Amino acid sequence: QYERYSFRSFPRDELMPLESAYRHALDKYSGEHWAESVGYLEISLRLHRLLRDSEAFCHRNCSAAPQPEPAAGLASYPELRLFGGLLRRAHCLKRCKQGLPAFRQSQPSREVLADFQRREPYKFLQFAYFKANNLPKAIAAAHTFLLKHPDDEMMKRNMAYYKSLPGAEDYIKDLETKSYESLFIRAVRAYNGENWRTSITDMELALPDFFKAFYECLAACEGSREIKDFKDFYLSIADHYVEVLECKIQCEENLTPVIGGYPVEKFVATMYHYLQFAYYKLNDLKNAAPCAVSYLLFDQNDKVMQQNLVYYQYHRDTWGLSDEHFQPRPEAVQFFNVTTLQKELYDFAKENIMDDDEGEVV
Amino acid sequence: GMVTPDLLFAEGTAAYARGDWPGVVLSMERALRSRAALRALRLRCRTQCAADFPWELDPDWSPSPAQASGAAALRDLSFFGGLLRRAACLRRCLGPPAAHSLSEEMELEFRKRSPYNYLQVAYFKINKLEKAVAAAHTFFVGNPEHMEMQQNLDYYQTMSGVKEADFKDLETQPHMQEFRLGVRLYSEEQPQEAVPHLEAALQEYFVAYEECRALCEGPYDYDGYNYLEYNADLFQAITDHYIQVLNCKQNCVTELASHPSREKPFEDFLPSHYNYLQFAYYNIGNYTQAVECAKTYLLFFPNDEVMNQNLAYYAAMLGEEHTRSIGPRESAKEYRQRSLLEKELLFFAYDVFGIPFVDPDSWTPEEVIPKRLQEKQKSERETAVRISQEIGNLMKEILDVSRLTREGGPLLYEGISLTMNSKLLNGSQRVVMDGVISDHECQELQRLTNVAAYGVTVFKALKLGQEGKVPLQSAHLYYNVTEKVRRIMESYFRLDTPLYFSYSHLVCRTAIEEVQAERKDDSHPVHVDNCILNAETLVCVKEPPAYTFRDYSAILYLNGDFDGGNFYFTELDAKTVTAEVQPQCGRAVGFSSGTENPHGVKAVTRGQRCAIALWFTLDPRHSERDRVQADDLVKMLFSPEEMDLS
Numbered sequence A: 001q002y003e004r005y006s007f008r009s010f011p012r013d014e015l016m017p018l019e020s021a022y023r024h025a026l027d028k029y030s031g032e033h034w035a036e037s038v039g040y041l042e043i044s045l046r047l048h049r050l051l052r053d054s055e056a057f058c059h060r061n062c063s064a065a066p067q068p069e070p071a072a073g074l075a076s077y078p079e080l081r082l083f084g085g086l087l088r089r090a091h092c093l094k095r096c097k098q099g100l101p102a103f104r105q106s107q108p109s110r111e112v113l114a115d116f117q118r119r120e121p122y123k124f125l126q127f128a129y130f131k132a133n134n135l136p137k138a139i140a141a142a143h144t145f146l147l148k149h150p151d152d153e154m155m156k157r158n159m160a161y162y163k164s165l166p167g168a169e170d171y172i173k174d175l176e177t178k179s180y181e182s183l184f185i186r187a188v189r190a191y192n193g194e195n196w197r198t199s200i201t202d203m204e205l206a207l208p209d210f211f212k213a214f215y216e217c218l219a220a221c222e223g224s225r226e227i228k229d230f231k232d233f234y235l236s237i238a239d240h241y242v243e244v245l246e247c248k249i250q251c252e253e254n255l256t257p258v259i260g261g262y263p264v265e266k267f268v269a270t271m272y273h274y275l276q277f278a279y280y281k282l283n284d285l286k287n288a289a290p291c292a293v294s295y296l297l298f299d300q301n302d303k304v305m306q307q308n309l310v311y312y313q314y315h316r317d318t319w320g321l322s323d324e325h326f327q328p329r330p331e332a333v334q335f336f337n338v339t340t341l342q343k344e345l346y347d348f349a350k351e352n353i354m355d356d357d358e359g360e361v362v
Numbered sequence B: 001g002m003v004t005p006d007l008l009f010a011e012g013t014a015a016y017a018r019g020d021w022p023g024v025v026l027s028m029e030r031a032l033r034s035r036a037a038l039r040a041l042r043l044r045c046r047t048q049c050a051a052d053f054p055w056e057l058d059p060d061w062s063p064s065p066a067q068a069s070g071a072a073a074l075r076d077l078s079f080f081g082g083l084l085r086r087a088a089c090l091r092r093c094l095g096p097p098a099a100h101s102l103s104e105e106m107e108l109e110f111r112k113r114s115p116y117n118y119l120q121v122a123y124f125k126i127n128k129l130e131k132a133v134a135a136a137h138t139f140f141v142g143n144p145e146h147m148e149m150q151q152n153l154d155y156y157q158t159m160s161g162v163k164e165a166d167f168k169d170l171e172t173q174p175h176m177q178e179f180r181l182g183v184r185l186y187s188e189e190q191p192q193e194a195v196p197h198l199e200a201a202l203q204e205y206f207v208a209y210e211e212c213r214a215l216c217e218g219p220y221d222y223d224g225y226n227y228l229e230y231n232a233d234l235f236q237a238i239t240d241h242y243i244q245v246l247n248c249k250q251n252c253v254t255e256l257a258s259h260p261s262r263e264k265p266f267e268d269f270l271p272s273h274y275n276y277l278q279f280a281y282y283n284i285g286n287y288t289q290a291v292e293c294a295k296t297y298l299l300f301f302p303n304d305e306v307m308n309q310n311l312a313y314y315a316a317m318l319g320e321e322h323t324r325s326i327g328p329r330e331s332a333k334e335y336r337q338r339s340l341l342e343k344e345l346l347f348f349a350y351d352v353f354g355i356p357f358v359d360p361d362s363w364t365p366e367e368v369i370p371k372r373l374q375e376k377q378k379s380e381r382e383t384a385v386r387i388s389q390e391i392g393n394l395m396k397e398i399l400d401v402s403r404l405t406r407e408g409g410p411l412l413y414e415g416i417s418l419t420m421n422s423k424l425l426n427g428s429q430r431v432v433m434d435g436v437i438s439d440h441e442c443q444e445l446q447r448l449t450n451v452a453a454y455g456v457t458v459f460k461a462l463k464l465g466q467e468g469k470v471p472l473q474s475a476h477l478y479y480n481v482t483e484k485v486r487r488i489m490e491s492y493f494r495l496d497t498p499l500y501f502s503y504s505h506l507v508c509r510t511a512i513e514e515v516q517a518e519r520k521d522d523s524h525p526v527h528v529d530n531c532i533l534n535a536e537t538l539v540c541v542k543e544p545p546a547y548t549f550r551d552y553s554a555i556l557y558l559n560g561d562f563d564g565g566n567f568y569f570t571e572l573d574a575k576t577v578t579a580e581v582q583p584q585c586g587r588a589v590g591f592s593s594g595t596e597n598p599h600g601v602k603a604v605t606r607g608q609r610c611a612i613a614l615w616f617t618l619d620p621r622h623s624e625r626d627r628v629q630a631d632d633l634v635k636m637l638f639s640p641e642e643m644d645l646s
């Protein structure tokens, strides 16, 4: 259902508010109609993706802006500088959000977005697909819902029933796919085929795409909140940021691609490990050294890598390398610093700020 | 023991109702000391925490491209880490936050110092004349509109043990008293004792100012029930909260110079201080201090002629090298720099977000204001001077002056006929005009209110129209008609100051014929929108639980077929009827919301009656926070833009 999608050009015939289309789809689904429900569900999914991409494009345009040079006197007053810069950012974001068409319709409520993030409409979509003789699409929808939620019961029985049906053994595809996971799968397949250059090219293409996606998912995570108490300035904003920080730290593991039903651990570490092994197999140390440095940064304990790092160090210039080849890549530094700082901030916050007035129910 | 003050106030009031004077004096003194201790503790903690962890700033960076998002993430994380550390220390210092939340009513009764009246009564009951006269004097100074307590301290002065020097205030701040004493005692042309007091009156001011700046970080001020549908992002919450905090900070320089004896705040406080100081210094003969004071005044208004002459005369009399030697006072320079930067930020916020602000100082240079605000101010001054010239010419052409000058307008829109003027309607500031809109518009408004419904604001109607429940043209017509009625009603009354909204909602009344049995009581008692009328007392009160900023009021009807539910104007006694207006289609009634115009509505009979009510204020501080949102929404929906996605 993602075939006829284009962020640059979106047909105006299907620009309705998200809740209206979703409610119409459910009302038709309860009314035993199938084709109309299928079309409306596809419309709703497309609209949600367009809204997400519009938010991403809006938040990439504003933050990545040059900092204006202020007057000499204003540099002596820190708080005014900081909040003036933040105010300029907010004004630019508000001005640029009156743009893209998807932001000129009704704003969905929090619960609709919450359930859409939970990928629940795919269940109704798969039932509708079954009721309209589109078996590969139904299989794909069932697998797509199963990937996010692997502990359910009825979906397992449905998937077993579909697998029992003949022919349905190759259309198992993830509808909500991303670029970097496909690139990673292709790179791993090439690596196991003892092919090196293709692995390097595809993996290097994969790296910055994942970094960009992760930064976007961090940026768009600063959602709203429901007001439930009145406090002073500092406390009543610190609580908001504590909640946002929780939802932020719950972001790295979500983006992790899964294969064989077991999500991989230390994804960037695996990336750099494969890159280093390929570069070593190509005997180009000039690129090999930074990968080893970065992975050893990400994991402080590994005998194998300490050994070959020492062996690398034993040949100071035998391969012809300089001191500019024993420091980590900038991107890995950025990622590691962001992750560590978020972890430390949450750890510090969950000792003093939030009130301890709720306990386990006995 | 740091107990909540309103509980002690209630206990003391109950004891006074019983009449136990020792109880009431104990309770009132405990409550006052509790408030003082609470304020001191909050100030000390909030001013120590922000000084223990200074605000950091390390902006030295130049990002290589495509290495851009990471820098933003790092900067944001560092800033919020600093904020979190500050908040942690502040929370660990302050303590239990329940006691600090008190409603308004005790705030107003604290402002009026009624507990001091209770103390004076109690102290007289127990023969404590010194404290009794102290309380009487401080209540008189706080509110000098009670002749009875004037007789009270006169009778207190009749019996012995009372001295003139015993009249000591207990509530007014030190700097204001010192400044007033200095000015008064310099008025006798005695220059010596003038210099020290004013100098003291200088220093305290700055210190006092600091404390106000540390008592402005308070809870957000939601517009009543608007927190149920609040949907602001984090970076919107920061901006809104900080803008409100900055506004409340900058509002302090118009409060530190407002004494309750005077009806209006003093003007140009610090420059007046410096002017009096320089005059006294010259009279005493401290010449260098005099040239210093003149120079530091000249830093505020750089274009004053008399003081230019004074400085020139001092510089000609004195050696020029000494005139060059001394510059302006450093503290005034620092204060000016801080205030100017704050004003620049606030004016940018006013330009962009449409959050109103009014300058409290008269010395700002005109380079800190954006262009659009300058153009709007020029237009406002132009229309004000035009109205002044028109009214002057009209007076030259001449209750009659009020009846012929304050109303009678152009009626700029066509099709409007003055039906009932002030002279016919038996009173002042009443207008009844017909044909504001045609029947079609009334029909669409009735359809809008019938489709969905007592609380449909223009913003809510536009939002529902955007959603799709109600047709959009009806909402657009509603917005246009409310703007039209604002314009015409404002222009009819010859108002120089621009007019602003305060509330505007549509309503419908549905007669319930099954509950009309023995319903002889009026639908709504006669009252006034500005104040609260206490019926038989025949006296109003500008009491904050009743809105005191609404100035003009207007109502327009839509339907033309029912019975009952008329509209009438009633005198202050709440008995006699002065005039009545028969409802019809397109009828508009407008009046000033002052105490001179009490309005009344009769009960309704069979049918439905729907109409729109509107209230306008003249103070730009009190404008809706949803009108700008509605304007932005209409600009969204009916003024589309385009930007290249490729």
Ligand SMILES: *[C@@H]1O[C@H](CO)[C@@H](O[C@@H]2O[C@H](CO)[C@@H](O)[C@H](O)[C@H]2NC(C)=O)[C@H](O)[C@H]1NC(C)=O
Pocket: A061, A062, A096, B643
């Ligand atoms: C970010 O958004 C701004 C907001 O419109 C855009 O900036 C435009 O930049 C181009 C050249 O870089 C100018 O010709 C336009 O006049 C700018 N538009 C303005 C000022 O409104 C643009 O979409 C983005 N800027 C980038 C990508 O540099």
Ligand SMILES: *[C@@H]1O[C@H](CO)[C@@H](O[C@@H]2O[C@H](CO)[C@@H](O)[C@H](O)[C@H]2NC(C)=O)[C@H](O)[C@H]1NC(C)=O
Pocket: A333, A337
């Ligand atoms: C996070 O950023 C900081 C500053 O931008 C850097 O911290 C330095 O890290 C190196 C090793 O990575 C140390 O030798 C330096 O002593 C650190 N300096 C400071 C001031 O902490 C680095 O880019 C990132 N941090 C780490 C630990 O890598």
Ligand SMILES: *[C@@H]1O[C@H](CO)[C@@H](O[C@@H]2O[C@H](CO)[C@@H](O)[C@H](O)[C@H]2NC(C)=O)[C@H](O)[C@H]1NC(C)=O
Pocket: B285, B286, B287, B288, B289
């Ligand atoms: C002008 O008034 C001051 C006020 O005391 C006189 O004394 C000076 O006080 C200031 C306060 O720090 C200091 O400059 C010195 O302690 C004092 N002397 C001088 C020369 O400033 C001062 O003497 C007076 N000047 C004249 C010419 O009478």
Ligand SMILES: *[C@@H]1O[C@H](CO)[C@@H](O[C@@H]2O[C@H](CO)[C@@H](O)[C@H](O)[C@H]2NC(C)=O)[C@H](O)[C@H]1NC(C)=O
Pocket: B473, B476, B477, B480
């Ligand atoms: C109220 O809204 C506008 C504001 O006057 C009225 O006129 C519209 O705005 C443009 C701008 O000048 C006019 O040229 C058009 O006549 C109107 N717009 C369109 C798209 O026709 C508008 O007519 C009023 N509302 C109604 C329902 O009449």
Ligand SMILES: [Fe+3]
Pocket: B529, B599
């Ligand atoms: Fe009323």
